[PDB]
Write a protein that binds this DNA or RNA. Structure first.
Length: 235
RNA sequence: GGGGAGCCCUAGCACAGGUGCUGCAUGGCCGUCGUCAGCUCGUGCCGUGAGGUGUUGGGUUAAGUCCCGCAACGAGCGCAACCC
């Protein structure tokens, strides 16, 4: 594992669109692209996985955010393997603040599901049930893994801390351990637990993610196998 | 034999009456923009604050009707809908 498997298919990106201090996490900038100093990546993942396993053996939630299509599908499965609530399709500004309104979005959602199992296949209006199907399906679209997150999650996992600095900014505001990961695109300090590495490599996603997931699984026992991987990665 | 009320009258009397004026005193009714697609609240964010937000962005629809984006997630009177 570690720096070697990382020298297996992924590293640093960003072709000079770089925040200053993320390049303090930089060895060279050859052929245009900066090279992430995976040595300090080992340092980071040390402190990182220290907290990851901390909260894991304690059980205090981590809040998988994924937005870019790639990571997106990927994240869900890993999150669905981890047991942590996530961000599936579209990130919203009412989760990491209006948490209660969205708790009523979940109440609503589960009401819909609870009336899929009610004799509304009998009476009831048909226009009304068209409405039903619509808002049902889209409610699922946004709300999927987040669907089971009551009480605030005391860290996130999250991919690229820039979009998912819309996401960060939220968490960052609320005093919450932004574990979260990207390249020389985002700024350092804004991340709580700074993971320095390419997000543009779907394999980087795969590795960093599933490593962390199976990691908290180890801090809870049961280690199995990373399912989503090399197929979608390159097919 | 005298007086009470139903009662009509003559005088003073309290009084009534006005389709006399002011819609620049008005309710109400209604006409209108015009079936216009608008108007707006909760909570989160943005700004020192007024306030912005949503609802600013693109297709589409009879439509703020529906989908996408998005610092927002909704919700209400209208829209629709139930009445004919």
């Amino acid at each position: 594992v570690k720096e070697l498997l990382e020298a297996g298919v992924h590293f640093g990106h960003e072709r000079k669109r770089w925040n200053p201090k993320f390049a303090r996490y930089i060895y060279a900038e050859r052929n245009g692209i900066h090279i992430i100093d995976l040595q300090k990546t080992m340092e980071e993942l040390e402190r990182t996985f220290r907290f990851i396993e901390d909260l894991a053996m304690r059980g205090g939630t981590i809040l998988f955010v994924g937005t870019k299509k790639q990571a997106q599908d990927i994240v869900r499965m890993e999150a669905e393997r981890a047991g942590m609530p996530y961000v599936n399709q579209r990130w919203l500004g009412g989760m990491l603040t209006n948490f209660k309104t969205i708790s009523q979005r979940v109440h609503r959602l589960e009401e819909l599901e609870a009336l899929f199992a009610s004799p509304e296949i009998e009476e009831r209006p048909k226009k009304e049930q068209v409405r039903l199907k619509h808002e049902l399906e889209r409610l699922q679209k946004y709300l999927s893994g987040f669907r089971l997150l009551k009480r605030l999650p005391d860290a996130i996992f999250v991919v690229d801390p820039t979009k998912e600095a819309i996401a960060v900014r939220e968490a960052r505001k609320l005093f919450i351990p932004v574990i979260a990961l990207a390249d020389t695109d985002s700024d350092p300090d804004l991340v709580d637990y700074i993971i320095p590495g390419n997000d543009d490599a779907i394999r980087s996603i795969q590795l960093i993610l599933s490593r962390a997931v199976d990691l908290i699984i180890q801090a809870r026992g049961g280690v199995v196998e990373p399912s989503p991987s090399y197929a979608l990665v390159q097919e």
